[PDB]
Ligand binder design. Structure first.
Ligand SMILES: [Ca+2]
Ligand SMILES: [Ca+2]
Ligand SMILES: [Ca+2]
Ligand SMILES: [Ca+2]
Ligand SMILES: [Ca+2]
Ligand SMILES: [Ca+2]
Lengths: 176, 170, 177, 170, 176, 177
């Protein structure tokens, strides 16, 4: 009743959302991928979007609150035989610090487990991203790996933490 | 005399029979196949795709096995590799020798920084071989594969280019 | 099973293009409508073109049943859905190999593939209600009747009623593992 | 406030007017063009080609110039770059600043080992700027370009990733 | 009359020559290119060959003597406005040490200057390839550059020497 | 040329798609056969399709002649061959701008582009033998007569004879550089 992340919801990403997606990081400071294919330019993103519209190996959702676009959920590496996927939550910089990361993570978990019928969801975060690690630990994720020097970013190799959670634990804890 | 050469179309029957038992899902450039004809069509579709690279392991003119480099990324300068030895040649120390050839190609030809591999946690022998070659354990991926009716846990191991080039490239 | 056992050499292998003549002659009599990935065919040439068009389609999967290198029959998994985690299967035995218990053995192999390789939750099949012997075989393998689809198929001049039977992943993995 | 952003289709008129005088042969992914319409068609044909990458240099929302990385090779881990400053913004020290942004992108984002550039041997000012940034002369390519009726000689200068990351990335 | 490099000639590369080309170095020990596109497998070479059959930016010739294939001449980076090209001579290992490198170099120079009407031909060779440097110096090439750590080969960066010769000097010295 | 000079503001710029209506109206009279990359056209729509098909063809190059932002005419370099290092050119002045000496000025610009940008060795042109004024202009610019092509064009009911004139790169670069 009295909270600020009460209007937070997911909806399917549309073509018209691409300008919002693109501006999440159009700085020539990182390599960005769409269905595992690199892009920088908006026009390149649009062409990749069109080429993969029926590809089920990734799925994306806009995070919105009261009609404004706050971020993106991506599920990638989706495999329905092993029943797993990786996810990532991206919050627009202008909407950080309002608790939306945590709320969106629960929405992503709910979609992956209760709609897609996955067994395992996992995520990767920088080892120095202590806040995200804390959020995911509190939601029930466990650390399964420390991938050493896995990404070259801004001139240095960074180490990431892989965390996972499983469908039985999720459905028990949040669908009791 | 163990060596690598590039995989060719005519090698596909050898590749396919490494496991044509309807007992596992197999992938080619991340696309599933079971039938030989399905593999052949996927092979044709990805002939210029640089995100994976494959090599036949041979000794004295016989085909011993396959090396696959997959998830190749030249910005992050890494790749996953897998060594598959034909069952009829598993007794002869080719796993270790092939692993060194894969390392040599990835580090000294492709100019990668990081090579990693995945092995079943119960595969103690392979884990030991890779530890002896200098690989370190970076993760234990829990229930990562559904195989033959159960979820299996795998070990991810990695090694880096400077350590390799120092130890084997003076 | 050890030295002193009866074991069958019946196995499944993935259907290949070169198997299509065997598939086609299982019933080339102009007596039934035949489908490949839900598209009708009669002529061998039509089957071949449909085969080519659906080579990478994951909604159906087929296997040749073989024993001692002879082709005995076909297993089809159709209507595969990995979100609801189910599929329908059918076992078709060549007429020249019927009456030797290959239907039952093939069914176990199909169950094993669907549950232990494909990671499905539910497998089901349809059989004619008058086919008491097949119903009994499937009951003995652990299938339960879930419904009776009335006049669901027009076959040889009359509407036939079929029985839908199913089995689930936990019961299977427990009982055969 | 000088920055890079990825080149877009809508930037092509700006690119084209940097030299639309019928006075030089210009190339896009190594294919010649003169007319704007020809550039636009080449742009469309190469939108996913990773062998070149381009960026608009901007300051305070105005378009100042273009950075091009060409001949990109991720096995040898090198690329050529060129900085082109609009004539109306040449007086303001943007050449040097843009060069540092190009270096930063090539070394700290793309993970290249070697960046090099070509400049006319008579362009003493540019040579001085690049020398001050740490580039060393590696060659003098004699009569390498026919321009305005005569063969011109150019200087090739290069710099490497370890020196860069040490000096500007601590 | 009495010499061994008297039957040496060039002819245009044909599709049927691709197996000979491929085996010049099918060891998974170097990255190979065809019209600047990478390949390893023979099938990949064949597809690239087909795609570039009318591309004039490169031209290749088989070096033969008495009907046997001894090597390959490649002219690449051909530009007819600047009137230049790079060339390379590759001698099959089983035919090295019979003076064919030098003879083939003269054939390549003759084609580039007297048929293609180029102004400048240049080549790159490893700095430690003292024999090739000597051959090219004796033919009239001058050193124009030392490209530092230009190729990663077999685990190390190698430095190459760029050498060039011009059409007037050539036509004077060998067409007097 | 310095403060106190007569200089022309005549320039060349690369032909664009949007220039095609100007090109087409230079001679849309059903009085002559017109070619684009050696393919015939009459209709504007046909020209546009030919333009699109040859956008990256390097065997011809065209430029609009302009003065003070008005379109005056067209320069065409055709039959370009970079091995023999030659091309043919033609200067076409819009009828409403003829008689003001733009032909001569445009010819110098075309010579400069062909020799100093394209690196050609030989430029040549064809002119009607009865066109004494154009012959004189080209003679004054340094062209020499190399041949007289007899009854080479059927035009307006009769075979016409033309004069081929040429100039070479060394003579040009010496005399205007
Ligand atoms: Ca993937
Ligand atoms: Ca991947
Ligand atoms: Ca269906
Ligand atoms: Ca190139
Ligand atoms: Ca090139
Ligand atoms: Ca012609």
């Amino acid at each position: 009743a009295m909270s600020t992340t009460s209007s937070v919801r997911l909806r399917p990403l549309e073509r018209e959302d691409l300008p919002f997606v693109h501006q999440l990081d159009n700085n020539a400071s990182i390599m960005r991928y769409w269905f595992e294919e690199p892009y920088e330019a908006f026009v390149e993103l649009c062409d990749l979007y069109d080429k993969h519209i029926h590809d089920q190996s990734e799925r994306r959702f806009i995070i919105e609150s009261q009609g404004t676009k706050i971020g993106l959920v991506e599920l990638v590496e989706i495999n329905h035989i092993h029943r797993r996927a990786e996810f990532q939550i991206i919050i627009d910089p202008t909407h950080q610090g309002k608790g939306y990361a945590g709320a969106a993570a629960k929405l992503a978990m709910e979609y992956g487990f209760s709609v897609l019928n996955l067994y395992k969801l996992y995520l990767i975060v920088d080892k120095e991203n202590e806040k995200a690690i804390h959020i995911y630990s509190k939601l029930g994720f466990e650390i399964e790996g420390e991938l050493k020097q896995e990404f070259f970013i801004n001139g240095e190799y960074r180490t990431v933490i892989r965390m996972c959670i499983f469908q039985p634990q999720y459905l028990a804890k949040y669908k009791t």
